[PDB]
Structures are given as structure tokens and as C-alpha cells.
Design a protein around this ligand. Structure first.
Ligand SMILES: [Au+]
Ligand SMILES: [Au+]
Ligand SMILES: [Au+]
Ligand SMILES: [Au+]
Ligand SMILES: [Au+]
Length: 289
């Protein structure tokens, strides 16, 4: 229902493809947004839909939360950028020429193709037959100030995960395409995990609200007066809204988004506030004996 009104600003456009951004940036209830509406089909991206009113990878990038890699794009024996992409097993639909993902360093990298050249299904090459990036991995993002300087990937008897060789091993091994949970913190690289311990801490911050749900349009909650605040508009809402912001009865209606709040992860017993958290099918070599 109220899932297509994004938090923050709501830009779901890639810096490369800026053509169709009248409806894809800033989203709202329009319909035409190739980089966002592909996250809303039930069954696809099960993690993002679970935390729907958080930010996608593109939104965090242009909400300045997540940075971009020094080769922000990569064309198509091949470029050294591909080493990271070849370890993850993804599936791009047809008629896509770009696709974004979270780098090893925690930045957002893209995979670009010439204009009429679409991406292969595996998203590793360019072939022939819209204007928007297909999110490769299922994730959501949030603004966080937790330091991840010491946090690294530690997994149960795993020799290599993704592009990360945790330990040097010459033993009898086991290779598989496994979907591994990962998270990104401020001063940390990607941290792959064995189990995914996500817990939300709900609150009353402006990102926990969806607005203009009566008479559809998106409203900026910033325009609503808080109690005693200055305002410049006249909002109304649920009990949660009318506890922090002053209400009447009616320039907009503001409710609370279920699950919206600061979400912490557990990494090796410690609980830290991550920037992004997601799922990724990568090559995993586990030790035996
Ligand atoms: Au933007
Ligand atoms: Au959420
Ligand atoms: Au080659
Ligand atoms: Au492109
Ligand atoms: Au396999």
C-alpha cells in the first residue's frame, strides 16, 4: 500500500541513466520506475520487502549515506572490475543496461552496457534485446554512525567467501553457490555472516512516518509543525503522529510505518548499527576436517 513513498528524499535513479526520472525520482505513486518497481513483486527481494520503508541501495547513495566506487561503472580479456561480479550469481531481466551492487569496500558499483546493448541474464556480459539500474542483491540501507573499524568477516570453517579469502587453506575443500548474509558499517568493508541477527528498535523519528494518506500524494513530514514548532503547514495523523507533531482537522495525514526504526545487527556477539544489510549468492569454499 504505502510502500512506494520512500523515506528521505526518495531518488531511485542512477547517476548514469537520468532519462526517465520524472516518475522514478522522487518516486511517489506514479508507476514508471524501473529501478524501484522491480523490488515490489512478491517473492522477489524477500529481505527488502520485509523492511520496506528503509532505503534501497540507490537511495542511500544519493541520500549521501553510501559512497560510490572509483570506477563507478564498468564496460561489458576483460576488465579487472569483473573479478568481484563473477563471484556473485545474479539474474538480470531483459532490457537492462545497468545494474548496481554493494562493493567489497562498501561502495556502490555499477555494470554498464552500450546503449542498445542489454545485460545478459547472468549480468556478466552485454547482448541485444529499460532506462534504469536493476538491483543485483537484495538489501536495505540506513543512516548510521557506528564505527566498524575492527569488524571483519568471520565464518565457521570457511576458507573463502565471495572475493574474501578469510584463511589460506590447502585441505580437502567444498565449493558451492551459497547465498550469504552480509552487512556494511562505516569504517568496515563487507562483512559476510553465518546467521543474520536483525532486530529493529522502533521510534518516532521522521523516517518512521508515511504522510498524506487520506485525500494519492506524498507529503514532506518536515512541513508539519511539531508541538510548539513553527510548521508552515497543517498535518494530522495517528496516535503516534499526534504525540510528536501537532494535529488538527488537515493539509496531510501521517501514519507510522510498521517495522520502521533503527535496526541493529549482531556480529560475533557484539551488536552494531549497520549502514546496509542484505543477501548475496556468492561462491563459498568451506574447509572440511
Ligand atoms: Au537525488
Ligand atoms: Au523498514
Ligand atoms: Au577472456
Ligand atoms: Au548506462
Ligand atoms: Au551448487
Amino acid at each position: 500500500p504505502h510502500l512506494r513513498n520512500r523515506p528521505g528524499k526518495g531518488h531511485n535513479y542512477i547517476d548514469g541513466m537520468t532519462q526517465e526520472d520524472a516518475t522514478c525520482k522522487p518516486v511517489t505513486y506514479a508507476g514508471a520506475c524501473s529501478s524501484f518497481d522491480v523490488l515490489l513483486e512478491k517473492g522477489k527481494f524477500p529481505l527488502f520487502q520485509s523492511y520496506a520503508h528503509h532505503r534501497t541501495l540507490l537511495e542511500a547513495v544519493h541520500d549521501t549515506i553510501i559512497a560510490k566506487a572509483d570506477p563507478p561503472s564498468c564496460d561489458l580479456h576483460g576488465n579487472p572490475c569483473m573479478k568481484e561480479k563473477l563471484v556473485m550469481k545474479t539474474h538480470c531481466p531483459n532490457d537492462y543496461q545497468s545494474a548496481h551492487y554493494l562493493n567489497n569496500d562498501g561502495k556502490m558499483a555499477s555494470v554498464k552496457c552500450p546503449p542498445k546493448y542489454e545485460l545478459t541474464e547472468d549480468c556478466n556480459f552485454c547482448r541485444q534485446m529499460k532506462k534504469g539500474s536493476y538491483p543485483l542483491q537484495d538489501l536495505f540501507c540506513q543512516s548510521s554512525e557506528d564505527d566498524g573499524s575492527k569488524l571483519k568477516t568471520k565464518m565457521k570453517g570457511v576458507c573463502e567467501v565471495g572475493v574474501q579469502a578469510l584463511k589460506k587453506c590447502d585441505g580437502q575443500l567444498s565449493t558451492a553457490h551459497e547465498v550469504v548474509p552480509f552487512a556494511v558499517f562505516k569504517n568496515s568493508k563487507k562483512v559476510y555472516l553465518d546467521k543474520l541477527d536483525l532486530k529493529t528498535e522502533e521510534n518516532l523519528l521522521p523516517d518512521s512516518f508515511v504522510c498524506f494518506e487520506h485525500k494519492l500524494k506524498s507529503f514532506d513530514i518536515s512541513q508539519c509543525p511539531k508541538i510548539g514548532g513553527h510548521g508552515s503547514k497543517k498535518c494530522t495523523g495517528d496516535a503516534a503522529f499526534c504525540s510528536a507533531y501537532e494535529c488538527t482537522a488537515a493539509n496531510a495525514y501521517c501514519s507510522h510505518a510498521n517495522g520502521s526504526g533503527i535496526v541493529q545487527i549482531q556480529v560475533s556477539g557484539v551488536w552494531k548499527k549497520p549502514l546496509c544489510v542484505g543477501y548475496e549468492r556468492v561462491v563459498v569454499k568451506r574447509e572440511l576436517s
